[PDB]
Amino acid sequence: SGIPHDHYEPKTGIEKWLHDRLPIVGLVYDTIMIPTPKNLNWWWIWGIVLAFTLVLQIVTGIVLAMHYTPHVDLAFASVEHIMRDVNGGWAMRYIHANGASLFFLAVYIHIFRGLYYGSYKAPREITWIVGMVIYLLMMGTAFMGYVLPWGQMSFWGATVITGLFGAIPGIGPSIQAWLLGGPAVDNATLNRFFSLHYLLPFVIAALVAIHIWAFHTTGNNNPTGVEVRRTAEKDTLPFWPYFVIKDLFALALVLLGFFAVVAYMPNYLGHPDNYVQANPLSTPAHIVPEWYFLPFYAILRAFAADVWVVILVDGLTFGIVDAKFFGVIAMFGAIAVMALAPWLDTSKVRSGAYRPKFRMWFWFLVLDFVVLTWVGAMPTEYPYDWISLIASTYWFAYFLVILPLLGATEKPEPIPASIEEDF
Amino acid sequence: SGIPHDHYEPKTGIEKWLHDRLPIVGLVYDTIMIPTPKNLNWWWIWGIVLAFTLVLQIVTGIVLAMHYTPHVDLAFASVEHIMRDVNGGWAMRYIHANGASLFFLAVYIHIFRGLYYGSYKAPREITWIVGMVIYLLMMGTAFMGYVLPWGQMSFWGATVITGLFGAIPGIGPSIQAWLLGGPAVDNATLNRFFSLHYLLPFVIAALVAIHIWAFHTTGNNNPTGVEVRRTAEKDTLPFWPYFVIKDLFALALVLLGFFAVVAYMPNYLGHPDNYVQANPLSTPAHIVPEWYFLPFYAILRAFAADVWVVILVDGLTFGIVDAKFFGVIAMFGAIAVMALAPWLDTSKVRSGAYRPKFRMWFWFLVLDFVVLTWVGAMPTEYPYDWISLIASTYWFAYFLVILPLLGATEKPEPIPASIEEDF
Amino acid sequence: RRDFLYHATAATGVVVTGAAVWPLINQMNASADVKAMASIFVDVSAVEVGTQLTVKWRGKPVFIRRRDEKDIELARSVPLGALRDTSAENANKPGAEATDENRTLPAFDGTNTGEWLVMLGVCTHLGCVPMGDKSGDFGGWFCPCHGSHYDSAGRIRKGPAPRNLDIPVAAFVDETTIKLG
Amino acid sequence: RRDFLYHATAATGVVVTGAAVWPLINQMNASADVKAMASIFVDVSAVEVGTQLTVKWRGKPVFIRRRDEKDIELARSVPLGALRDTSAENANKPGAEATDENRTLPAFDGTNTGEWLVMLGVCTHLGCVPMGDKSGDFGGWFCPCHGSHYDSAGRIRKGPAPRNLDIPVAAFVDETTIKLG
Amino acid sequence: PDHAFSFEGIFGKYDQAQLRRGFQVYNEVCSACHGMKFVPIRTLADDGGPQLDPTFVREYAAGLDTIIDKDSGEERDRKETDMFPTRVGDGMGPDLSVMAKARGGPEYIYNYVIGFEENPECAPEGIDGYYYNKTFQIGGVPDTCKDAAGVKITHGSWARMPPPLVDDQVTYEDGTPATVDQMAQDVSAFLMWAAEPKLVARKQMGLVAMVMLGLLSVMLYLTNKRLWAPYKGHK
Amino acid sequence: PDHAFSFEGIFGKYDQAQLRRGFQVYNEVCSACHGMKFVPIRTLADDGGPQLDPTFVREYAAGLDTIIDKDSGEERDRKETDMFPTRVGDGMGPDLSVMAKARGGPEYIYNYVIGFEENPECAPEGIDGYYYNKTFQIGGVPDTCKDAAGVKITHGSWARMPPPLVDDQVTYEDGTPATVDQMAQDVSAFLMWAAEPKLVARKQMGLVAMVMLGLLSVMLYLTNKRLWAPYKGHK
């Protein structure tokens, strides 16, 4: 059971004088020969993808910062200095910019893999909490970063996603001014964002430290509602070399596609308007902040008192909870409820591979995510308003009511024993 | 023996559900209730001082970077923007600038405490190695940082301490250009230095991580040549609350003095010429890089073929080893030999409190350090040249020959037993 | 005493910690160079009355647009009913009803109001810049960030934006100038 | 085979890693905007021959100083013996001996050398700027960074600096100009 | 058909004669109003695009406007190391440094320059000082051409730029019919260069990396199939 | 004796009348050649120093040179938000923004302005265009005054600045003998302000922190003495 196999430091004198600093003991006993089940599909790779992508972003950023100059008058020029003069330039920038896209794409699949195979269910709450914390940090990071080029979309995205904090009453304008460094956006905001943007990744790495510490102490989830049967465990092959090699193969494929993009379709995920300098006096059409924030942008700009299911007219009972504040609360709740999940699913069961109704609702949820992604880009004119309202309502409904009802009446399936599934 | 007292997680349900993430187990069992001897004097505090100073510097820097603009045309102006407009300004800058001074002062006492009480002697080699690595990183950091204000001393200090790398043959100019971003100093160097300067502190923290991991696995030295007698150990009170409170008291005193300086004598340790903008066309008199690099500056500019003990005329046997390269090697060796110490002292003994000859030689070494500090500021005219040569020669002599001879014939003292020294 | 001394040491440590933390949260506030926040003299100077005029100030645009009769009549024909924000955000006067007579502007040092209207070109939803030049579904301004329809006089309509376009404190400089501040 | 396949996978991984690392070490090299490194036309234009003239170029100063007879005679009276660097660093000619006849400069398009001397104002020790205007213990230049005494013609003396002050490639523009590059 | 360029694909390293033609046009036509500050003059020798002769570059540079200085205010000789000039206002337009990315890009410029036909049969009078363009979409439209809800019934809108070229505005030294269409294509390619000069290096890197990573991935697949063999053989 | 200032110590928050006098002196004498770019004009209302009336500040600002713009080249009215002007060359000197720190500082300025006496009895002819000072140390010296190894026998050296003031150059509105010494002291204090405006806040913070930390340290000493009591009582 949970064989650590510390190696007893019996190799030789080198492995015996290393009794001063244990380090190799840690690596070997824990982070390399960690028994993992055999039943792992191709959905348990994306964590390696995320770690590599994080390293990539940190490196490329440390390189760019050697040529980026945070100032309204010299940011655009420095970016062009990069893409033209520097030796590698375009590569670093395109790899930095697009890799953010892959990062978020990979976390999406990392998260939805989790919702299916009960990875939030006990005893794996801490991992979930830490993951939501990370998600928040990395969203804030990417936001701070999209601003640095001082293009045109930078300015206005910052403007609105800071007016949010100002929507709330009493302490809105104060926070807004304390965050922007002033009444509106200017170089001060740029300096804050650069610093902050150059600091959070390390916090993320530490949090990834705790993320990795947790699921090593707590066994990796597995396609089944079963554990490694610790009591000797013919199942649960080790990590190295088997799963290391599997993950590296998938990672090679992913990097292949990523570099093909970088080299042929690099400006595809971007907004052309970010290639024109900023004008605080003129706003372009369809700001469309980005593609990894459209869901929440839509959940925000949906509630506007423009439907018979408009709960804003009812929330107006209290004269303080206006629309804006309502949408902001709705977004914060869209995330808080995803974090609260493990204490809402009242099921003494596990992976939805044995819960059909859950399968249907979950695929509807994935569809809802895609729809929200597609709607945040389209105007607030009919019919898109009804669509956004329906989708947000279903998100909240799933995460609040649907899981309890299932946990109550959702066991028409024969659960599998013997995690050694030699089929 | 080595009582960890994991606490068994018997407190309550909170301390029992924390069996998902051990964290509190680590803190309690290891990093708080770490048995430390009773025989500790006031020289075992400076590590807490260093940790706090590092945190202070990191914080103040993260704040400054919100207003500093890396560019030749806007650095000085941004520094003045800080010291005038910003709310706190002068405080952050003076605390950042001077705290570096305290940092190095504190590491000096941390290191010399070590040389006395055989803290480099086995089984504490890894700590020593890691400490020298750190010292290097933090020297490089402070150097990169003194440049950012783009004053006058910045430029020329950078110029010379980069011409060093160019002294060596074959791969000197290439490295010089690859480090400066060009033939000479300009904005590119500034960007590199800012980035680098804003990144190494985290590496230092990690290295401090390993630094703290090591001497927790390996017992804290103690005033004597004795261990905690693991086999139950009435000696070795715990860290918390006793030594925590002692260190915090000393730290309060130190911060008191430090803030008195910051508020009354802040520009004392500085160079006024760093308050005039840079002129690549005019060099001031007595550049005098700083005060924590004068020893090595002197060891460098001492060997010049201007004494009957001039080994440069002899090293000229090989036409490649000229003077400059000789001084550079001498400096790198001045540090490498301090790192090699634990394998040069051939003594089966410990703290020099029981080795008189060692006491005398060690106080001579401290005097040599002070003298080198005082000499790097004075010209290379007679008699200072002879002084610098003598001092460097004694440094090398100590660390190479003196310790072996002692380890041979240096045991006229009764060593103390029973680390419980109830005198 | 055990309790008193221990708790007092803890309290003093906490107080010092807070006194050290506050400035790390104060430096991010508006600095003195941002404190200035003063006025601007924009000269109307025959810009062909009826299309628009925009000028930068305080980091935001200040819209100075003449009036087109059709725009005017549409304005003056708006009863307070069915008007989201009837407060006439203009700070040059009290909270008087959001009426075009009060909402257009001072009268050149003369006596007339249905000819000029200078408001802050900042959407009250989240601070975007609406597009002018007769746009939207009400012959006024349209915000492209979320779709808020403004009217001729600038009062909010058809969108999430809660209130109309504010009007800063401004007076005239004897028939060719505007004072913003 | 076990050995072949495993070792080949490792080799390919290593190769890819290196191909990815190299640019992270290449970007820090001089960029194309630093590649330029071209020439400058400085006009002597009667600056009162005998004191000095300094101009910025390539990020370093280029010293153009006329000659003072006492400085000249001290120069021409220096035998190659007791001269640290006798190579005449000047790149406008071969490694001919560091003699004042070759070491002063071209002759205005005429025939004379003991009147002008333009060298690179960069100490060969570590690149500091020596102080001019008759300084040091040899009536020339003095480096304040470590104490290197230069002579009248710029040849190094009395210090760690190994070689004299180099002389870039320069020709005259017909009696009032200098071409640096 | 769509008149695809050379670079439109996995290959097509910027046929350079096209770019020299675009340069002949840009400096003689578009430069009168437009600028390219984000473009150094020394790039007309760098590989990939117009590999002109450096000496001609220095000549053409000295023959341009006067960019004064950064240290001592004095009208210099506009050395190549400087950037192309900037036309800012009073009847002038934006900067074309990266206009090929702020819009499939070059096709916009081609189909924009192409198309300035007379005013349609909805508003033949048109507007004073504004001219009509088939493809610009961010211009004003008269009320006579708008529908019932503000949308325009015209394909394009009214742009403030006049027609830049006639039937035979300039001569090509290489020998080629210099009609409007060829000039438009050429200048579009030149602007795409000015925006993406490092295109060919992009493509070559992409090829090299695709190859090396396919190799690595194949080898890893073999290693995986091997290691996992004794556990996937009976089923 | 040494004519210590007010701020020379643990107290001395910049007696403001002295600074107003120094301002009368600086704008009417030193401003002709020197500048203070690193100094905003609005600081003449901020506390600590000259708490002048804002309206006078705006007037004095509009009455200065013309600082053109940063966005649209056009000679503006020079609003207070801008910085003091800059005199750069052609018989002009450095910037006095932080000259009080690039040298005990203000004493240098006092003992420098003080001292321009005639040429000594070693070189009475002196030099053409250069004037003599007894305290500047970074100026040239004639060969007649140097020793055998280049060192000067004079106290100071020859500075390019002329004597700035005579016996009664300007009047003080408050009523005070405006001799040279008082003006020198006043202008020195003004420059020290221009360099260290946040001095008084520095001192008050230092006091507060010394106090709080002494308190904390005393309490920790008591706690230590207590905890370590049962182990240090028999000896």
Ligand code: HEC
């Ligand atoms: C002045 C006589 C011009 C010359 C000659 C050329 N251009 Fe221009 N251009 C000019 C103006 C005033 C504008 C702004 C138009 C507006 O309505 O805002 C432009 C615009 C362009 C654009 C941008 C179009 C867009 O979608 O915003 C392009 C791509 C452009 N012009 C191209 C172009 C070329 C290739 C030229 C030389 C052949 C050229 N223009 C000449 C003014 C003038």
Ligand code: HEC
């Ligand atoms: C031109 C007529 C001047 C006026 C009036 C004032 N100053 Fe000046 N100053 C001037 C020059 C050309 C120089 C450079 C001198 C040199 O030899 O390099 C200076 C220098 C100073 C300095 C710096 C001295 C030093 O050690 O470098 C100071 C502190 C100074 N001047 C002060 C000063 C004051 C207070 C004035 C008004 C009372 C003033 N100067 C007027 C030119 C001129």
Ligand code: HEC
């Ligand atoms: C060491 C510095 C650094 C790190 C670490 C870093 N970046 Fe950046 N980032 C930059 C710089 C510099 C820019 C501006 C240059 C650019 O846009 O490429 C930038 C810009 C961006 C952009 C906008 C790209 C563009 O071209 O508009 C995004 C998105 C972004 N960062 C996201 C991230 C995310 C997400 C992470 C990690 C979680 C990250 N970055 C890590 C330095 C860094």
Ligand code: HEC
């Ligand atoms: C909001 C949720 C969430 C986020 C965001 C998240 N994780 Fe996870 N992660 C999980 C969960 C749940 C598991 C499953 C743990 C288990 O099975 O015991 C997991 C597992 C892992 C694993 C091991 C198994 C696997 O799925 O590969 C790795 C490695 C990992 N995460 C890395 C990362 C990294 C690196 C990041 C970010 C840079 C990240 N994760 C972000 C929740 C998250």
Ligand code: HEC
């Ligand atoms: C987050 C950024 C950051 C960190 C971390 C940081 N600094 Fe700095 N440092 C700066 C900035 C910004 C400046 C320039 C402003 C200034 O000089 O105060 C600077 C300047 C300096 C200076 C010159 C001070 C002066 O005023 O001339 C020194 C010395 C220095 N740093 C040393 C250090 C050392 C040693 C460390 C930690 C080991 C450190 N710094 C940590 C940001 C930082």
Ligand code: HEC
């Ligand atoms: C080059 C040597 C060196 C450097 C530099 C160094 N250390 Fe140490 N450190 C030591 C040695 C040796 C010991 C003694 C360990 C023992 O007694 O087991 C030690 C002990 C310590 C201790 C515990 C006992 C004590 O002396 O306080 C702390 C805490 C500590 N170091 C922190 C730091 C921090 C933080 C830094 C830098 C930011 C640092 N040290 C830099 C060598 C070094």
Ligand code: FES
């Ligand atoms: S920001 Fe103006 S409507 Fe959303």
Ligand code: FES
């Ligand atoms: S740098 Fe010129 S002598 Fe040391």
